[PDB]
């Protein structure tokens, strides 16, 4: 059971101008774009920030998640969480990048747990 | 200028029980408690997570901030931000742990920038 990265979430109307800003602020000339199931929402990652773009209406449900935890194994965390007062409210579900699940911790925090599959050369 | 860490923020009613949970969840047996100016609010850091504890009312204002960026130079970032469409909402202000400020980026994101010097 290992947390690989803790990703902070930001919500914006459009990725383009926002990305340019974060590439400058974080002094990182590249960002990742992910294939996702939700329509009307675009996802990008720069440094440890996940930029979620879409209309205020499309973004509303996404704002309920406090942060995203990239982990080595969803199953290991699922077990720990269920045995520690947490409620699995979505998934585990297969997604283009691997598998995800959304969890409500006992303290009320809502966290998205993500597990990335293989997928190879951009660097 | 560099962003040293990007801290995600979680809001809870009581720090102690939550701290124990996250130490186990993140397999991190040590957390840091900070002396802060606010009253009725307790702040702890575990890994790159900031746990903010207090009443629903005491926490309300803190929830308006999406994340906290720890930087090496608050002044340099203030200049960069003001020159790149961001608005300085609060601060820079002196606090027990150094200095911080709240900023609203052009895209609407509200971020707390913090500088440690003690």
B61-86 CB burial, b ≥16 within 10 A, e <16: ebeebbbbbbbeebeebbeebeeeeb
Q: State the SS3 of chain A.
A: CCEEEEEEEEEECCHHHHHHHHHHHCCCCCCEECCCCCCCCEEEEECCEEEEECCHHHHHHHHHCCEEEEECCHHHHHHHHHCCCCEEEEEEEEECCEEEEEEECCCCCEEEEEEECCCCCCC
Number of domains in chain B: 1
Q: Which residue has the tokens 């629903």?
A: B56
Nearest CB to B10; choose among A10, A24, A66 = A66
Using alpha carbons, list the distances in angstroms from residue A76 to A61, A105, A113, B68, B93: 26, 15, 11, 29, 43
Domain ranges, residue A123 = 2-123
Resolution in angstroms comes to 1.8
Q: Do B109 and A2 touch (CB under 8 A)?
A: no
Please tell me if residue B66 touches chain A, with a CB cutoff of 8 Å: yes
Record: contact B17-A84, CB cut-off 8 A: no
Q: Which of A91, A100, A87, A90 is nearest to A34 (CA)?
A: A100
Distance separating alpha carbons of residues B61 and A44, to the nearest angstrom: 27
Please report residues of A whose CB lies closer than 8 A to that of B9.
66-67
């Amino acid at each position: 059971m290992k947390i690989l990265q803790i990703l902070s979430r930001l919500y914006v109307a459009d990725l383009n101008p926002a990305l340019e800003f974060y590439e400058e602020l974080l002094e990182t000339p590249v960002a990742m774009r992910f294939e996702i199931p939700q329509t009307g929402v675009e996802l990008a990652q720069i440094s440890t920030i996940l930029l979620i773009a879409g209309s205020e209406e499309a973004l509303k449900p996404f704002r309920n998640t406090q942060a995203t935890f990239l982990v080595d194994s969803l199953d290991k965390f699922k077990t720990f969480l269920e045995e520690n007062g947490a409620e699995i409210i979505r998934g585990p579900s297969k997604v283009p990048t691997g598998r995800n699940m959304t969890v409500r911790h006992s303290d009320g925090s809502v966290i998205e747990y993500v597990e990335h599959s293989k997928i190879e050369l951009y660097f």
